[PDB]
């Protein structure tokens, strides 16, 4: 029992520390798929212009 | 009674999860090339930027 | 745990593959462009003063 | 059971952090913008090729 409780306290602390480091990653799910499409077009144009 | 109920519920859950794992393994052989593809992509971006 | 990690790795692979396809042509034509453009810009800049 | 849940969460978050530069919309958006600025510039240069040649 005493070993299990100590393991919970350690993992909980590690999670709290990682969530704080990842504050910028947690914002609004803009449709990742749309950004990639747009990027695809821009790169393709860039290549053609070069 | 409580324990009987809990075991029955868990068994039902275990079967359901086994069906889901069999569908996912038909896709995975090719994983040995991930870290290499990420670094490759990162490197291409760094070069462009 | 295993099912949840596999689902996330699959999503990552899909995203990397889509990017590699479009970045590869741009990195290959970079060095000739940069050199031609810099020489061009320097030549143009010498006419303004 | 509680330890196992939190451990999974931690593992997931770690994976997401390690691949954010190439996968997260925020970072990808910045790269798009830089590319669009250069495109526009090159378009302009190509449009004024004659004048630039004469100069």
The structure's method of determination equals cryo-EM
- Whether A19 and D13 have beta carbons less than 8 Å apart is answered as yes
Q: Please tell me which residue of chain C has the smallest CA distance to D51.
A: C44
A15/D10 Cα distance (integer angstroms)? 6
Q: Which of D22, D34, D35 sits opposite B41 (nearest CB)?
A: D22
What's the token pair of residue D52? 């630039």
Å between B19 CA and nearest CA of chain D: 21
B15/D54 Cα distance (integer angstroms)? 78
Contact criterion met (CB < 8 Å) for C20 and B34 = no
Distance of CA A25 to the CA centre of its chain: 4
D46/D48 Cα distance (integer angstroms)? 6
Contact criterion met (CB < 8 Å) for D31 and B41 = no
A22/D16 Cα distance (integer angstroms)? 9
């Amino acid at each position: 029992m005493s070993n299990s409780v100590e393991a919970l306290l350690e993992i909980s602390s590690s999670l709290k520390a990682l969530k704080e480091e990842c504050v910028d990653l947690c914002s609004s799910v803009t449709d990742g798929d749309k950004v990639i499409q747009s990027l695809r077009l821009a790169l393709t144009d860039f290549h053609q212009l070069t | 009674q409580l324990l009987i109920k809990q075991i029955r519920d868990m068994r039902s859950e275990h079967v359901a999860l086994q069906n889901q794992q069999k569908l996912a393994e038909k896709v995975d052989r090719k994983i040995s090339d991930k870290d290499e593809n990420i670094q490759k992509t990162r490197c291409m971006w760094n070069t462009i930027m | 745990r295993d099912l949840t990690l596999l689902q996330r790795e699959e999503r990552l692979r899909d995203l990397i593959e889509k990017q590699d396809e479009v970045l590869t042509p741009v990195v290959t034509s970079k060095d000739p462009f940069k050199d031609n453009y810099t020489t061009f810009a320097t030549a143009l800049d010498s006419t303004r003063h | 059971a509680e330890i196992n849940q939190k451990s999974l969460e931690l593992e997931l978050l770690r994976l997401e952090k390690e691949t954010a530069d190439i996968t997260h919309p925020l970072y990808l958006g910045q790269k798009h913008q830089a590319l669009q600025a250069m495109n526009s510039h090159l378009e302009a240069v190509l449009r004024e090729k004659r004048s630039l040649r004469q100069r």
